[PDB]
Amino acid sequence: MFFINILTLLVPILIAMAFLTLVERKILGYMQLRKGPNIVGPYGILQPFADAMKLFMKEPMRPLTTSMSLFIIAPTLSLTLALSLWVPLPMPHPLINLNLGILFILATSSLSVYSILWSGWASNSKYSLFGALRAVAQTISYEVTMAIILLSVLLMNGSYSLQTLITTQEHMWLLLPAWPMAMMWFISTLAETNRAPFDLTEYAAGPFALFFMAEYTNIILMNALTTIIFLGPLYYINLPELYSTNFMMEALLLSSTFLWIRASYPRFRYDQLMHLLWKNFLPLTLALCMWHISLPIFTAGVPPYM
Amino acid sequence: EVRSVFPEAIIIRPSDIFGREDRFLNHFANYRWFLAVPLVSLGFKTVKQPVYVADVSKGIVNATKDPDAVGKTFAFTGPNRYLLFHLVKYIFGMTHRTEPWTTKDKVERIHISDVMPTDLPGLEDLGVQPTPLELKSIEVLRRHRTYRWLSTKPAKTVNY
Amino acid sequence: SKVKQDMPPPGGYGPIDYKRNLPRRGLSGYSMFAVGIGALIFGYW
Amino acid sequence: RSRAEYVVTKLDDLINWARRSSLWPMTFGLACCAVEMMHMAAPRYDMDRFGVVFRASPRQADVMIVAGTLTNKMAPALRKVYDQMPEPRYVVSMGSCANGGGYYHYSYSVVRGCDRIVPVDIYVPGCPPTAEALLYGILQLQRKIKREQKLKIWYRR
Amino acid sequence: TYKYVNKKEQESEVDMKSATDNAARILMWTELIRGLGMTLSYLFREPATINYPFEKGPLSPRFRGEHALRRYPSGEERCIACKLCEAICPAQAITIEAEPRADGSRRTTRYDIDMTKCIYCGFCQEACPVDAIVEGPNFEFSTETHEELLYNKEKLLNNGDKWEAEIAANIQADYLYR
Amino acid sequence: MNLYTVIFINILLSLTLILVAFWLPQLPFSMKFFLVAITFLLFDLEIALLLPLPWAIQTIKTSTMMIMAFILVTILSLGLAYEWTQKGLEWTE
Ligand SMILES: CCCCCCCCCCCCCCCCCC(=O)OC[C@H](COP(=O)([O-])OCC[N+](C)(C)C)OC(=O)CCCCCCCCCCCCCCCCC
Ligand SMILES: CCCCCCCCCCCCCCCCCC(=O)OC[C@H](COP(=O)(O)OCCN)OC(=O)CCCCCCCCCCCCCCCCC
Ligand code: SF4
Ligand code: SF4
Ligand code: SF4
């Protein structure tokens, strides 16, 4: 039964990823006064499948100077980290209940920036290596600001569990007490997923398809994590389907918000992005971290261990 | 059969042709993907003189345009005879490293020695100077090199 | 005969509002700061 | 015919459908014709709706749209970019310049057609041919690669 | 006259309310929210996409498309081998050879127009004194080989016979302007 | 056992995806990147210090814990201020 639960978790996530590619095409088209794909399939629902089949059907131009070991390792690592990122998520019940699931999430993102660094070093080009170093510095800085923000909001929550977060959120959203933190967390998740305006942008066919799959899977996961942490869905002990549906709706709105932002904004500069983080977020992140340290002490609202 | 049905047919017999898209130099480069080099009798008994594909094509075109080539058999061979082991040593040291892939007929033709072209006319008789593998080998084996080795003594030539 | 040719109407074309027109819409800075602080205190309580 | 050839034909249908439904170009764009290319990318004609993705890298490209005048200084760059593109690659020449030199046919620094450098699959005539006509050329390319029977040729080998 | 695009009149001072407004603007992303809103408005408009090939872009009778050689209503070729089209052809895409026909008429033996050399400028159809060569409205004639765009007299006459029901109507619609 | 099974399934799925992806078709150093890398090291170890705060919030001696956390985040701020003042945060020659 556990393997059946594994299948019914992972396969719909991949379906959501492919249709996220499709809905990004359609929303960007309709925001550009045009249409998305609709010829391929009834209403474009076969377009991501055609894209994936073409990407797996085209031969991969594999250069011999590139290390086959790293060329293999980077996309398979990125996809398996996206799926391992997805597993410990309660909706409102998880496939796997971890004691420190948020620490698991952040460290899995660290292994993802290993994946992008290894892909960049395997790509034997100096411009590719330079862009790889820029992307790793981007991902690393937004990872440190995610870790501090998430630490402070779980100082409000009580533990690194996520069912504890559900019990925290069952009366109100955490957006009201931690909304500047929510804004900075949203921007941080954007720059982790390398979406516009933080995209700042090598592989053909198979590896490119794998990287595309893992990136869009990470997009859906950052949306789901933002939903579960900051915008608590309605939870009732006698029915979990209401929680699943409401979390679904908020995750779809946050994914549409990423596509909205990519349509609306021009991309940042590399110096401007580092300047933005290290001069506006991290000072505010540290100040609000100490504020959220101080808050349960002077309000006596120290959360329970369970 | 070709000489029976078309008595004045120009028959051209080249040796093992090497080139950019050949199945000779790329084949010997693709032996490295296994653990070692599988040579029968360590390749000492086989003697080969490979011929460049551009040389063979120039000979073919000059045979189309040549009035004296009618009803003749030509031998298109390289200027230098190498042993199979020395050829493998040269290709591996030039690469610097250290549709079936191969068949029984393929390895039999590999281990068959090249005959001495004595009575037959050749590329010099059709007006083509046979360029050597040392001069026309870098453009073939460069695609199998590594990055450190992207940016070698010739194998010695026997008369027999 | 009478010449027929692509001409403007006798009354002339209407005015064309070529100037920049930003709507100038938006809530005030003091009151959005006030509602943000109020949301913060309500959430904290 | 044999039952295996029917399965091979259906597999060809599936592969050709995938390749023509997902046609990602890079436009090696030079000139007037590249401007008309981005007018085909424009919302009226919507090659993205057709399944044809605007601004793809040559590493991810399927077809090269040669749009403009190929000069002698640019032809090695064209050949290098064509060689960097992966093996299932097609070429749509567009405009009189890329077709046969066009209005600069007798020029000292203009290659008389990009077919002297790269193998052109489909020529789109005009100066510039309309975006309507370029989208015609793209759909003709989809029909052409629908007509391919690669596993049928391999089975009949 | 002239006007300033970035200069501002005098000073608006430094008031606490203005400082609070600027701080709210760059702390709560007001211009970002309004840009998101009007991009959402375009999400909620109607797309300007036509349904090719079932819908076609609008054109005019002046449109310069595929070349064609017309005829008189009797069926005689309108062309009289006068070579002004190749004289005025700025790309030198027209080659004409001519001789008297068996009845002594002045007709062409060769009329080749290179589509790959043509710039589709209409100089031939505006220099033709008898309305023989025309740029008819066909534009969907992309070929898979370079040879098929090297038109000759037979191909041009076939195009003229094919598109005569539309070329003559376009010339009827527009000939009073030219 | 469950997490082992899921991670093995994940790795197997990704490996079979790359296997079908292959089988189906048949220098000038810059100092500033190192600076932000080591700044990340220092801030990440300071996160490692800051991370046990969900259990440190439950202690009896809340005043001492609060003072230590305040001092630590203050020296985070002071180090970041140092690097900002000595221009380790900009990208300029
Ligand atoms: C979680 C749910 C979803 C939330 C987000 C919803 C979607 C919103 C999408 C908006 C568009 C985002 C696209 C990317 C934009 C990138 C640019 C950007 O945002 O730059 C950030 C900009 C950068 O500003 P900048 O670019 O002008 O630079 C500032 C520096 N100068 C001016 C010198 C150049 O703003 C910030 O960094 C501020 C972040 C928010 C801080 C909010 C603080 C509020 C008050 C704090 C609490 C105070 C009271 C404490 C308690 C008191 C109790 C009594
Ligand atoms: C291509 C090469 C790729 C190389 C890198 C692969 C990365 C894979 C994706 C990331 C996986 C991250 C796993 C991190 C470790 C687990 C984290 C964790 O929280 O573990 C503790 C947890 C139980 O702890 P707790 O929550 O306290 O529960 C007790 C209360 N009931 O759970 C446990 O105690 C379970 C202990 C095992 C958990 C990890 C299982 C790993 C499985 C092996 C992977 C490698 C297999 C060999 C190679 C295959 C081919 C490459
Ligand atoms: S064919 Fe005509 S429109 Fe196209 S690039 Fe050449 S001159 Fe410009
Ligand atoms: S339209 Fe073409 S054939 Fe006619 S004059 Fe112009 S370039 Fe020459
Ligand atoms: S201008 Fe007209 S009539 Fe004269 S040669 Fe040309 S097509 Fe014939």
From Swiss-Prot, chain A:
Membrane topology label: Multi-pass membrane protein
Enzyme Commission number(s) of this protein: 7.1.1.2
Alphabetized Pfam families for the sequence: NADHdh (PF00146)
GO biological process, one term: mitochondrial respiratory chain complex I assembly
Main location: mitochondrion
The keyword NAD belongs to this UniProt entry's keyword annotation: yes
Top-level taxonomic group: Eukaryota
Catalytic activity: a ubiquinone + NADH + 5 H(+)(in) = a ubiquinol + NAD(+) + 4 H(+)(out)
GO molecular function: NADH dehydrogenase (ubiquinone) activity
Keywords on record: Electron transport, Membrane, Mitochondrion, Mitochondrion inner membrane, NAD, Respiratory chain, Translocase, Transmembrane, Transmembrane helix, Transport, Ubiquinone
Regions crossing the membrane: 2-22, 70-90, 100-120, 136-156, 171-191, 219-239, 241-261, 281-301
GO cellular component: dendrite; mitochondrial inner membrane; mitochondrion; neuronal cell body; respiratory chain complex I
InterPro entries registered for this protein in UniProt: NADH_UbQ_OxRdtase_su1/FPO, NADH_UbQ_OxRdtase_su1_CS
Localisation per UniProt entry: Mitochondrion inner membrane
Quaternary structure annotation from Swiss-Prot or TrEMBL: Core subunit of respiratory chain NADH dehydrogenase (Complex I) which is composed of 45 different subunits.
Function: Core subunit of the mitochondrial membrane respiratory chain NADH dehydrogenase (Complex I) which catalyzes electron transfer from NADH through the respiratory chain, using ubiquinone as an electron acceptor. Essential for the catalytic activity and assembly of complex I.
Family from the record: Belongs to the complex I subunit 1 family.
Protein name: NADH-ubiquinone oxidoreductase chain 1
Organism name: Mus musculus (Mouse)
From Swiss-Prot, chain C:
Transmembrane segments annotated in the record for this chain: 27-45
Top-level taxon of the source organism: Eukaryota
Compartments it resides in: Mitochondrion inner membrane; Nucleus
Family under the similarity heading: Belongs to the complex I NDUFA13 subunit family.
Role this protein plays: Accessory subunit of the mitochondrial membrane respiratory chain NADH dehydrogenase (Complex I), that is believed not to be involved in catalysis. Complex I functions in the transfer of electrons from NADH to the respiratory chain. The immediate electron acceptor for the enzyme is believed to be ubiquinone. Involved in the interferon/all-trans-retinoic acid (IFN/RA) induced cell death. This apoptotic activity is inhibited by interaction with viral IRF1. Prevents the transactivation of STAT3 target genes.
Subunit relationships: Complex I is composed of 45 different subunits. Interacts with CARD15, but not with CARD4. Interacts with STAT3, but not with STAT1, STAT2 and STAT5A. Interacts with OLFM4.
Descriptive protein name: NADH dehydrogenase [ubiquinone] 1 alpha subcomplex subunit 13
Species of the source: Mus musculus
Gene name per UniProt: Ndufa13
Full-protein residues shown: 4 to 48 of 144
From Swiss-Prot, chain E:
Known role: Core subunit of the mitochondrial membrane respiratory chain NADH dehydrogenase (Complex I) which catalyzes electron transfer from NADH through the respiratory chain, using ubiquinone as an electron acceptor. Essential for the catalytic activity and assembly of complex I.
4Fe-4S ferredoxin-type domain ranges (all copies): 70-99, 109-138
Listed GO biological process terms: aerobic respiration; mitochondrial electron transport, NADH to ubiquinone; mitochondrial respiratory chain complex I assembly; proton motive force-driven mitochondrial ATP synthesis
Keyword Acetylation carried by entry: no
Gene: Ndufs8
Domain of life: Eukaryota
Name used for this protein in its record: NADH dehydrogenase [ubiquinone] iron-sulfur protein 8, mitochondrial
Shown residues in whole-protein numbering: 35 to 212 of 212
GO molecular-function term, one example from the UniProt record: 4 iron, 4 sulfur cluster binding
Residues annotated as binding [4Fe-4S] cluster 2: 89, 118, 121, 124
Catalytic activity: a ubiquinone + NADH + 5 H(+)(in) = a ubiquinol + NAD(+) + 4 H(+)(out)
Cofactor binding remark: Binds 2 [4Fe-4S] cluster.
GO cellular component, one term: respiratory chain complex I
Localization in the cell: Mitochondrion inner membrane
Chief subcellular location: mitochondrion
Reported cofactor(s): [4Fe-4S] cluster
Subunit organization: Complex I is composed of 45 different subunits. This is a component of the iron-sulfur (IP) fragment of the enzyme. Interacts with RAB5IF.
Bilayer topology: Peripheral membrane protein
Keyword hit for Ribonucleoprotein: no
EC number: 7.1.1.2
Keywords noted in UniProt: 4Fe-4S, Electron transport, Iron, Iron-sulfur, Membrane, Metal-binding, Mitochondrion, Mitochondrion inner membrane, NAD, Oxidoreductase, Repeat, Respiratory chain, Transit peptide, Translocase, Transport, Ubiquinone
Family label: Belongs to the complex I 23 kDa subunit family.
Amino-acid positions noted as binding [4Fe-4S] cluster 1 in the UniProt annotation, renumbered to this chain: 79, 82, 85, 128
UniProtKB/Swiss-Prot annotation, chain F:
Keywords (A to Z) from UniProt: Electron transport, Membrane, Mitochondrion, Mitochondrion inner membrane, NAD, Respiratory chain, Translocase, Transmembrane, Transmembrane helix, Transport, Ubiquinone
InterPro entries: NADH_UbQ/plastoQ_OxRdtase_su3 (IPR000440), NDAH_ubi_oxred_su3_sf (IPR038430)
Entry GO CC: mitochondrial inner membrane; mitochondrion; respiratory chain complex I
Span of the signal peptide: none
Membrane topology, from the record: Multi-pass membrane protein
Regions crossing the membrane: 3-23, 33-53, 64-84
Annotated compartments: Mitochondrion inner membrane
Disulfides per UniProt: none
Reactions performed catalytically: a ubiquinone + NADH + 5 H(+)(in) = a ubiquinol + NAD(+) + 4 H(+)(out)
GO biological process: aerobic respiration; cellular response to glucocorticoid stimulus; mitochondrial electron transport, NADH to ubiquinone; proton motive force-driven mitochondrial ATP synthesis; response to light intensity; response to oxidative stress
Similarity annotation: Belongs to the complex I subunit 3 family.
Summary of subunit composition and partner proteins: Core subunit of respiratory chain NADH dehydrogenase (Complex I) which is composed of 45 different subunits. Interacts with TMEM186. Interacts with TMEM242.
PANTHER family in the cross-refs: NADH-UBIQUINONE OXIDOREDUCTASE CHAIN 3
Protein's recorded name: NADH-ubiquinone oxidoreductase chain 3
